[PDB]
Known about the structure:
Protein name (chain B): DNA replication licensing factor MCM4
CATH superfamily of the domain at 328-657 in chain A: P-loop containing nucleotide triphosphate hydrolases
Number of helices of chain B: 6
Subunit structure (chain B): Component of the MCM2-7 complex. The complex forms a toroidal hexameric ring with the proposed subunit order MCM2-MCM6-MCM4-MCM7-MCM3-MCM5; loaded onto DNA, forms a head-head double hexamer.
Shape of chain A: elongated
Oligomer: part of a larger assembly
CATH class of the domain at 328-657 in chain A: Alpha Beta
Keywords (chain A): ATP-binding, Cell cycle, Cytoplasm, DNA replication, DNA-binding, Helicase, Hydrolase, Nucleotide-binding, Nucleus, Phosphoprotein
Shape of chain B: globular
Largest sheet of chain A: 7 strands, mixed
Subcellular location (chain B): Nucleus
Family (chain B): Belongs to the MCM family.
Amino acid sequence: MSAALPSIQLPVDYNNLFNEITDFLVTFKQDKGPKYMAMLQKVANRELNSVIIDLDDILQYQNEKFLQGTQADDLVSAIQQNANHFTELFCRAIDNNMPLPTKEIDYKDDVLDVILNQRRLRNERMLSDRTTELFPPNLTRRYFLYFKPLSQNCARRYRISSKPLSVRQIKGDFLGQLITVRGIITRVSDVKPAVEVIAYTCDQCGYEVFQEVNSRTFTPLSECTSEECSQNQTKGQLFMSTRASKFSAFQECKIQELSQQVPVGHIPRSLNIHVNGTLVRSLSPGDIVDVTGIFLPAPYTGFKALKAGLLTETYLEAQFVRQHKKLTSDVEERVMELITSGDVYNRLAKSIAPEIYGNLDVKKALLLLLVGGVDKRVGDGMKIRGDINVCLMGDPGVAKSQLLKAICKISPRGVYTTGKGSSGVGLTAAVMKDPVTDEMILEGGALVLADNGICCIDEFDKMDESDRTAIHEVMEQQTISISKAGINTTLNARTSILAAANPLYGRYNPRLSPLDNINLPAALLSRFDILFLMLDIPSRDDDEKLAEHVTYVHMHNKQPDLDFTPVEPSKMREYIAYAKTKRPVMSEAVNDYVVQAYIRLRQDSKREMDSKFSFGQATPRTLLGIIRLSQALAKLRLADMVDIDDVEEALRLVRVSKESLYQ
Amino acid sequence: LRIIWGTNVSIQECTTNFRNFLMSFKYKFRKILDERDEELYYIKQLNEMRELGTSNLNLDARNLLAYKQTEDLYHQLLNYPQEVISIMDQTIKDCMVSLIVDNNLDYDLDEIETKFYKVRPYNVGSCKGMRELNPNDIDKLINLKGLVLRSTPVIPDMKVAFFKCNVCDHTMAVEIDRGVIQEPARCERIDCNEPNSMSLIHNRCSFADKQVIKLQETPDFVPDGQTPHSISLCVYDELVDSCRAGDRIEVTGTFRSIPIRANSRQRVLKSLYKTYVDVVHVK
DNA sequence: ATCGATCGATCGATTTTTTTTTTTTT
DNA sequence: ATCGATCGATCGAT
């Protein structure tokens, strides 16, 4: 009626713009014929569903409707303001301009499109002997449509919609708007197919029923609306036919603020967004992206009279996504810069943590666990690690925590952790109530998350018992055991293990004997193959030279020089598993020799006897590992020949792990 | 040659293609394994089944490939697994009955054929984890793996509803049938009518077990950062309770999704449908 | 014409809900 | 806000 709900004029009109839409639709120049022709048949070809659109090309054809007239009102200035009218009406012209066949449907291919022709086979035959309802254009689509906005070099044309923004930068006037913001993903609760229109079937009168559903809910129809059952005493029964009704894949995510955008006060703002179509599964939780999409509110249900006023509360929809930080063939050559350089075991050893000065010998062993291997298979079976567990003992911090910052970063499956920090419940699959979608789904991590990869660790003395026993079992490795609740499972943890821990308070006392200084259990240290004692005595010469490096930065961003060229991880990492494919086989020559030095070590460590320097007893596990060491060391040489120097090279690192306690 | 409406897979003759497939295989599947027991897998195992009267055949899948015919049935089963099992469980009955007529009097005698037989097909292609799953996949057989997070207590389900009126009082009732229960306002006894409320004693009506199990699959190959998603399942009969919780399993079934009332008072259903496994077969 | 059942317009009732300060045990 | 039952009348049957 007039008055209430008044009809209101706006200077903007798409009536001829829809024609101007089809002027732009199909026909086009810049990219034989226009890009929109065979590409729209490309969807008619059914090798594509998602329809991708950008604001970039609209400007040129708008320039093409411009320069180059006749002059026409701009679409794009009417887009970012609404653009939801463009997600349909601009798109609704596609049935008019789309080719009929355009090729063979075959059989499969797929279902649906074989049924949808049957639905239209049933729909057209309804009117065949009938002599007039038809399937709405929205009822049969089968293809998604997307928009990617212009930043851009077009904005400096000069020409806005693409300017990255904070959640804090989100105005209320941006509702309805196709917009773009940078943000960190969060949640990313699982996607599920959602129907636009139920298909009920009358049975008795048959036909087909299509009722639209919007947002979260709908009110389902009943009885029979079919006209054959209309005005007849008998109304047919109907319920939803899921094979018939169309579905849409629906994902969603919260988007956190980058935290540099944030004000000094307040709080990071999570932003709810909902993923749909081919755009689904395009994101993971915690990833940083410039998000581009239209922003619309989805009230209400309710409540209702509760809200009031309405106070929309809205949400954002995802139009498009731009993510931040997205053989043994020819990459062997990318290995070959340092292959021709040689010194794989050193230059790469020097390649480790170029940021921290000295302790390259410590870094020297770092290269081994970063590689490790190679395990064994006894066929019993019992598999043996296979993995290096390294500990670092010294205080104060020395910036030891920094070594883990570099190592895990480079390392695949790199996981940095600390005593508290992740608990043993954090290293196990632990039941927790899932917000929104329910319920009580288990989420594991840490050890379970770090399996088949290195785990860096700090506050290792403060991990207490609950962690110690777990990692005590994590030293049994290849397992994580939970008898808790109804959960009886034991899950494989392939985790590589390294934790640096601080000596007994306040710092280590040279008078203090070994193992009295350490805060860790002996059985906990016995399954350790290596520990590097970090005790720091001031050396005026060394203090300057290191201070000099501490002078050298902040002075500049580039540390390494006079002289060296640390390998970048990507090219460096590629040699890792490339070397890990080797699996060196032991030569018996070095084989028995390692046995020889063992009974020597089984002798000398025991002849140390009571207290003092220690540690005994030189158990076979270390030899079991020391053998694996040359097996890990051989991998850097590859060649799987296991040299004796390659063997003895580890034995050199064995005594060095200790004996610095004299310093 | 008839047809099935949406299935576009004609009734019978697939039963025939099923039989000559069931009647003769040997190994054409070894042709894919490239050879390197000569008799067909089924007629031996089909015999193995008849004595025990266990029914519930576990099928094979894939023996429809590589072998002919059924090459399309191999497809047509994967297109519409629900209806395919419907003909096949019945045909196995006749395929037993057809087997018994040659040996004539068997198992004392024709009543053992009256016993129901059914296929529990497995190894349909290879499904990819869970998280990969498509909307288009609405109903199709799926190979899956995971250990059971929790086993719920067995849930009772409707088969044939029991009914009565004020008069006489009389016991006339109708099966639950579809997902709806339709009770006449009247009436049985006196007939009559009269328009009495229809009495329902639920202890009299039929029941069967459907036992819900939430299952977290561990397909590995985890997309990272994807969460350790879990899986809903209902199952039925022997499939019910036969699955211990906490055990990694090959259990297969078609996809399923169904709506639920938002208010749980109002008729309104919430949009998109919640999804669960059809638990077609276990391993 | 008495009686009924039948449909509809009348009437009115039902729509969220668990975490941070604790405290007796060695 | 919608669904629910009361209750009112009316048009057919006997």
